[PDB]
UniProtKB/Swiss-Prot annotation, chain E:
The gene is NOG1. Belongs to the TRAFAC class OBG-HflX-like GTPase superfamily. OBG GTPase family. NOG subfamily. Involved in the biogenesis of the 60S ribosomal subunit. It is found in: Nucleus, Nucleolus. This is Nucleolar GTP-binding protein 1. The chain holds residues 510 to 611 of 661 of the full protein.
Length: 50, 105, 76, 152, 73, 52
RNA sequence: UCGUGCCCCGUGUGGCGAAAGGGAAGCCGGUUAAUAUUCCGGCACCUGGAUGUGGGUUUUGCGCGGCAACGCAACUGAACGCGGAGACGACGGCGGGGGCCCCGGGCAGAGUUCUCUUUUCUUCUUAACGGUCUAUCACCCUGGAAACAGUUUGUCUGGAGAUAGGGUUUAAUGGCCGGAAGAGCCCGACACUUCUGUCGGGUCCGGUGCGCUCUCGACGUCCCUUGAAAAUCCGCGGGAGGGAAUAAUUCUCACGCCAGGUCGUACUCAUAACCGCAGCAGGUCCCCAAGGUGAACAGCCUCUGGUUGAUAGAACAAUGUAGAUAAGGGAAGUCGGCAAAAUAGAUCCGUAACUUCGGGAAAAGGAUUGGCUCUAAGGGUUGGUAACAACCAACUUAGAACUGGUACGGACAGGGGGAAUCUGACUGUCUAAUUAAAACAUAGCAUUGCG
RNA sequence: GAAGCCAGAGGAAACUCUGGUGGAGGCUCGCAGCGGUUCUGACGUGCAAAUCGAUCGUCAAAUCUGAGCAUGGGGGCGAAA
C-alpha cells in the first residue's frame, strides 16, 4: 500500500535496484559462465515474501 | 414606456449581393410575433432600413435580440445561407452577418 | 484579510515598518476604489468611492511605502 | 502514429472526458509533435484541438407531461401504480390540515374575531377532527357567533 | 444529423473550403469573381540549460546495459 | 534538513529559505533547496556546480 | 560565583498495544509527461520561545456596567481541592441550513428549421480565515391564571410562576462586507514560422418542493440490554507569594521577532496490477450517486464519465443449449400435475371455518383501468361581515361529456387459489464440497448442590 | 396497525360505541446485502479441486461485516452435525 514503513520501503528499494538484467560486458569476460539473471524478479510472477 | 433599438448589419453580404435586405425585411414583418400571433406589429414594433444593408428595429415591448438572431438564422436556412453566414453579436443590440473562416485549398 | 473603515487608522497601519507594499484596485462598474496594504500578519483593505478624498489619500500615504495600481489582468 | 498521450493531455487541458476530445485528422503529424501541455494549449488556441459539445438530452417531453399532469391528464386508475397512501400519505394530509387550522385559529385570536375560551374549544375540536377544512371551521365560527348573538 | 448519439461540431470550429463555398455561391448564382473571395480566404547560461533540458527529454543520460562495451563490433 | 542547509552553507556559501526532502524509490534522499531571492540559482549552478 | 548543601511533596511504583477509537493547526487558483490540502502565487492558522511599542490597571492597589440573565480588549494568582469538555446505544416522525434535482426572465454561443417551434441545449461560480446583524432550547424582570389556559404531526407544560409584554445567551453549512475578481468560466476582434499572446464585453435577476443526500436541533419509543477509557484543555473554590507613582505591572489585550525535526506520499484496488498454480465468469472492507416512467438507489430508456475488450469469415443438416407458438380435447401423460401455463400493480364492493380473540386475510368471489376536453374540492402572504380585496403557488382526490379499440398495470414489473391429514410452538441455527429437517437452540416448567 | 392522546353519542358513576391521531412488534410483501429450497437445469479432462441460470428463504434483527486481541491438538470451539 501507500502506507508503508521505512524498513519495508528500504527492502523494496533494494529489490528494485536488484531487478535488472546483467550487463553486456559480463558475457565478454574470459571464463564467464553467467548468461542471464537467474534471480531476476517480476511483480506479477513471484512475491517478495515481506 | 421604454424603447429598445436593435441593429442587424448585413452590409458585407448585401454588397456581395447574396443577402436581400428587402426580402429579409418582408420576412421579419411576416414572422415577428407579438403576444403569440404573427402579423401583430401595430404600434409596438417598427422595422426599417437605415441603408447600407442594415435593418433597424424599434421595440416598445420586451422583444429579444436572441429572438431576432433566431429569426435571422431561420431566414438564412430558408435562403440556404446557414452553412456559410454567421450572425455575431458585436455590440449591445448589434448583430452582424459575416462569412465563416475560409481556408484556401 | 481585514477591512478598515477609518482613514486615520489606515494611515497609521501604512506608517508601520512591517508594511511592505500597497496597491490600488479600481472597480469602475461598482464606482469604487480599494486601498490594500500588505503587513506581516494581515492584509488591510479600505474601501472608498472614486473621489478626490481617495486622490489626496494617495499622497497622504507615506512616500517610502511602495504603491502600485492593480492591472486589469493578473499575469502569473 | 499513436495519439493516446495527446488525447489524454488534451482532455486534461480542456477539462473534459477523452470522448469529448476532437483531434484534427489532417494535422496528425504536428499534433503528434506536441509532447507537452504548453504545446497542447497552443494547438487548442490554433483550433487543431477542440472540445466537442455535450450530447443531446432535452427536457421538453418531461415538461409537457408535467403540464398535462397539472391540467389533469394521465391521472386515471390505469396510470396509478402505488397505493393511495404511497402516492399521498394520510399522515401528511393530516399534518397539513392541522397546521392550516391552527394557523387560522391563532390568526383569528390575534385579530380578535374569537375569544380565548372559544378558541380553546375550537382547538380541541380541530384536534378531535370535526373540521374537514378551513371553510368548515369558518362556518362553525359563524354559526357560533350567530348563536351567541341570539342568546345575547 | 446524428443528434441521437452525438452533437454536431459547430460551424465556427471548422474552416470552410474556398472551392466548396465558390461552388455553392455559383449554384445560387452570385458573381464570385466580382466580389473577390480569393482575397477574403485565409491561408548564455539559460540557453545552455534549455539545451540540456531538450537533451534530457530526448536522450537518456546513461545506458547501464551497454555502457560497459564500446566499439561497434 | 538542518544538516543539509548547514552543509550547503559550509561548502558552497549557499543560503536557503526552505528545503524539501524525499526518499526516492532507489533508496537515496533528494533535496529541493530554494535559495534566497538575492542570489541567482542559475548563476550558482553555472559557476559553483557546473550545471550550465 | 557553581558542578557540593538545605528543604517540601511523598498512597502508588514501567513499557508495548488502533494509518477506521481520542487528537494543535491550510484554503483557493495555477502548474508536470508522470507529484501535489506537499510545488508556485495570493491569502491564513497552530505550537514553542524570546521580546519591545501602543493601550489597560494602580496612592480607594489587582477594572467597569446593566435589577438580572451576562457583557466589554486587558483584569496577579502558589500548595491543596471541586467541576466540565474529551465522552458515546438503536429506532421513528418533525423543523432549519448546505449541496444536488425542477421551473421562469436576461446576455453570449451552439443546434434545429419541408412545416412548426419568441424554440432546445450550454457558462452565469465564490474557499479557508475574519468583522458585523440575526436564528432551537435554556435563563432573567413586571404580574398572578377556573369561565382553566398555552401548545405539538405526536399531550405535554403552568402558583416549585403560565399566557402576555421586555431582554440575556450556546448554536450558521444564514444575510452583508473583506478575501475577490485581479481568480475561474463564456463570447468577440486582431496578432501569430516559432518564441508568444494582446485588447475588448459579460459573469445578472427570481421562484418552487410529503423530492434525494449530509448536518444541526427540540421531541418521542425500547431494555432483567442502559450503550468505553486515557492523553489533553479550560473554569471555579482558596488566597501563598508578588505588588507603584523614583513609576510599577505574576496584563490569557492588539501590533511587532524567531523556529518548527524524522518517516509515508507514484500507480492498481480488480471479468488483467490482491488471493485462488493463471491476464481464472469465483472471492475480497468503504465514500460520492443525475434525468424519465414508476410507491420505489425494482425492471426499461437517456446525460456526465467510460468502454466498444473478451478468435474471426461462410452456410443454416440431424441431435443439442436457451427462448417461443400451436387447431380440437383438457392430466386421458407420469411413481407422482415434474416442467410449463394460468394469477399478479392500483381503486371499489365483499370475505367463511377455526382461534391463544392477537390473527386467519391480499382469505374466497366480483366491478373497473387508454386518450382528450372540462368541472369541483383540498393553500400562503399583506392591509382597519377583513364572512372583504390584492398578489402568489404546488401536488393530490372526486365527478361529467366526447372519442379509438382485437388490447387500455398495452413493454417493464408483478400472489394461482382452496379443502384437509401428519409433524415441529413460532422468530432463529448447523453437517463449507450429496442430507435444512419431526435435528439443535429458544422462552416457559421442574429437579439437584452451594452461606 | 399496540399502548398513549382528541372529539361526539350514551351510561348515576365504573364503563360502552363511533370517527380520528399515534407509530410498537425477535410482524409482513419486497430492492441491495446475507443464505442456498427446487430444476430428469447448464457444466462434468468446467470459467470454477463446488462455478453459472432461473426459482427460493430472510431483509430493522438471535441481521451482515472490517481491523486489533484471546482460546492451540491429551487441546480449543461447537444454537451439538
Amino acid at each position: 500500500p501507500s502506507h508503508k514503513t521505512f524498513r519495508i520501503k528500504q527492502k523494496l528499494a533494494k529489490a528494485q535496484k536488484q531487478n535488472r538484467p546483467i550487463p553486456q560486458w559480463i558475457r565478454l569476460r574470459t571464463g564467464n559462465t553467467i548468461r542471464y539473471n537467474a534471480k531476476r524478479r517480476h511483480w506479477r510472477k513471484t512475491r517478495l515474501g515481506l | 414606456k421604454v424603447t429598445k433599438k436593435f441593429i442587424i448589419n448585413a452590409s458585407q453580404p448585401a454588397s456581395d449581393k447574396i443577402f436581400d435586405v428587402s426580402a429579409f425585411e418582408k420576412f421579419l414583418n411576416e414572422r415577428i410575433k407579438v403576444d403569440g400571433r404573427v402579423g401583430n406589429l401595430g404600434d409596438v414594433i417598427k422595422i426599417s432600413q437605415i441603408g447600407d444593408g442594415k435593418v433597424e428595429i424599434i421595440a416598445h415591448n420586451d422583444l429579444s435580440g436572441r429572438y431576432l438572431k433566431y429569426l435571422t438564422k431561420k431566414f438564412l436556412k430558408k435562403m440556404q445561407l446557414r452553412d456559410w453566414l454567421r450572425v455575431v453579436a458585436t455590440s449591445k443590440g448589434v448583430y452582424e452577418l459575416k462569412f465563416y473562416n475560409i481556408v484556401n485549398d | 484579510p481585514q477591512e478598515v473603515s477609518d482613514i486615520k487608522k489606515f494611515i497609521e497601519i501604512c506608517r508601520r515598518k512591517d508594511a511592505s507594499s500597497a496597491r490600488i484596485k479600481k472597480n469602475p462598474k461598482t464606482q469604487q476604489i480599494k486601498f490594500k496594504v500588505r503587513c506581516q500578519r494581515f492584509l488591510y483593505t479600505l474601501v472608498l468611492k472614486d473621489s478626490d478624498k481617495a486622490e489626496k489619500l494617495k499622497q497622504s500615504l507615506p512616500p517610502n511605502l511602495q504603491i502600485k495600481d492593480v492591472p486589469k489582468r493578473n499575469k502569473r | 502514429v499513436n495519439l493516446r498521450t495527446q488525447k489524454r493531455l488534451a482532455a486534461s487541458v480542456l477539462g473534459c472526458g477523452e470522448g469529448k476530445v476532437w483531434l484534427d485528422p489532417n494535422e496528425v503529424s504536428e499534433i503528434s509533435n506536441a509532447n507537452s501541455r504548453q504545446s497542447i494549449r497552443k494547438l487548442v488556441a490554433d483550433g487543431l484541438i477542440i472540445k466537442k459539445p455535450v450530447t443531446m438530452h432535452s427536457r421538453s417531453r418531461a415538461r409537457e407531461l408535467n403540464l398535462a399532469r397539472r391540467i389533469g391528464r394521465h391521472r386515471g386508475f390505469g396510470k396509478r401504480k402505488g397505493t393511495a397512501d404511497a402516492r399521498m400519505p394520510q399522515q401528511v394530509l393530516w399534518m397539513r390540515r392541522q397546521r392550516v387550522l391552527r394557523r387560522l385559529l391563532v390568526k383569528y385570536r390575534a385579530s380578535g374575531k374569537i375569544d380565548k375560551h372559544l378558541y380553546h374549544e375550537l382547538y380541541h375540536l380541530a384536534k378531535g377532527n370535526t373540521f374537514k377544512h378551513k371553510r368548515a371551521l369558518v362556518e362553525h365560527i359563524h354559526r357560533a357567533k350567530a348563536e351567541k348573538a341570539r342568546e345575547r | 444529423k446524428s443528434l441521437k448519439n452525438r452533437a454536431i461540431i459547430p460551424r465556427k470550429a471548422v474552416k470552410k473550403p474556398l472551392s466548396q463555398l465558390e461552388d455553392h455561391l455559383d449554384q445560387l448564382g452570385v458573381d464570385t469573381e466580382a466580389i473577390g473571395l480569393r482575397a477574403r480566404a485565409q491561408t548564455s547560461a539559460k540557453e545552455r540549460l534549455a539545451r540540456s533540458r531538450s537533451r534530457a527529454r530526448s536522450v537518456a543520460a546513461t545506458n547501464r546495459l551497454q555502457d560497459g562495451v564500446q566499439g561497434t563490433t | 534538513k538542518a544538516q543539509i542547509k548547514q552543509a550547503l552553507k559550509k561548502l558552497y556559501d549557499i543560503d536557503t529559505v526552505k528545503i524539501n526532502t524525499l526518499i526516492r524509490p532507489d533508496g537515496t534522499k533528494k533535496a529541493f533547496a530554494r535559495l534566497t531571492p538575492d542570489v541567482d540559482a542559475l548563476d550558482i549552478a553555472a559557476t559553483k556546480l557546473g550545471l550550465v
